[PDB]
Write a protein that binds this DNA or RNA. Structure first.
Ligand SMILES: [Ca+2]
Ligand SMILES: [Ca+2]
Ligand SMILES: [Ca+2]
Ligand SMILES: [Ca+2]
Lengths: 154, 152
DNA sequence: TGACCAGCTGGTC
DNA sequence: TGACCAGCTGGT
């Protein structure tokens, strides 16, 4: 019905090829949970996806939590819609990989070690107990903090 | 390795993203943008700038839902379903888009009339459950197909 | 920002 | 088949 549709059809074959490339890499839907972006991070860093929980591992066995952000829209990294010590429990264990995008375009990739994150885990932990054991609705990690505390791996 | 293929494939992927922006979709890889765009272009609907999602030329607003029947057979509704969520939901028809991976299979339409069955269920359960939010109660594709108007 | 608000979904017994 | 269990985020 909408005319632009024929353009989508011309494009679609290549899109399907990208999906195949993502499927070849453990991602089954490039349009789900940022699959399309996650692939970019994997192919660049040489990390592999893990089939909930940690998101990836390197050839050394190290597992990681991976995060994305569209700098064209926001500056604070999302974490979890219901943060609490149990969620912070999983997080504290592995280093994180933060990817920065301008839309779907990969800008950079930083890597923070658990130590680089205690600060926020402590804040959230502190606020948790205090607020009367009330979950925190997606607290954010500034892109600035990531850039100044992580290691630019890309 | 495969990084090359991705780089080759990229110009097009970027066109699709340009095409989505044009149609009010910020990221094709976020919140299923790439798929929302497919439905808009087929149905001819227009996105809405996060309650209702699209609207027709007549000005009728819709709640739009998607699914990969390769993985699941139940439509997600809301992670924290409560009588407020429901109150709004009750105001507009729904567009259900069925997919096989990234391949759009079909699209259906449901009137609030045809969803009141589930609204009542969640509401009653919410109230009698001690006012506890329901964690993403699902609407079966079989229900959608049997009570909805195929529009694709 | 710190802190509130609010989206899109799959997985399973 | 209902009812629980979880994930990816942006907006102010
Ligand atoms: Ca995770
Ligand atoms: Ca993540
Ligand atoms: Ca909505
Ligand atoms: Ca929707």
């Amino acid at each position: 019905s909408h005319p632009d549709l024929n353009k989508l059809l011309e494009l679609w074959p290549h899109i399907q090829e990208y999906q195949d490339l993502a499927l070849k890499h453990g991602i089954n839907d490039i349009f789900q949970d940022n699959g399309g972006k996650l692939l970019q991070v994997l192919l660049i860093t040489g990390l592999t996806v893990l089939p909930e929980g940690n998101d990836a591992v390197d050839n050394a066995g190290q597992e990681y939590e991976l995060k994305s952000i569209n700098i064209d829209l926001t500056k604070g990294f999302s974490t979890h819609h219901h943060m609490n010590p149990v969620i912070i429990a999983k997080y504290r264990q592995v280093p994180w990989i933060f990817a920065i995008y301008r839309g779907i375009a990969i800008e950079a990739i930083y890597r923070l070690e658990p130590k680089d994150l205690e600060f926020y885990y402590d804040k959230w932990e502190r606020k948790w107990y205090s607020d009367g054991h009330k979950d925190i609705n997606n607290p954010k990690i500034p892109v600035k903090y990531v850039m100044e505390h992580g290691t630019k791996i890309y």
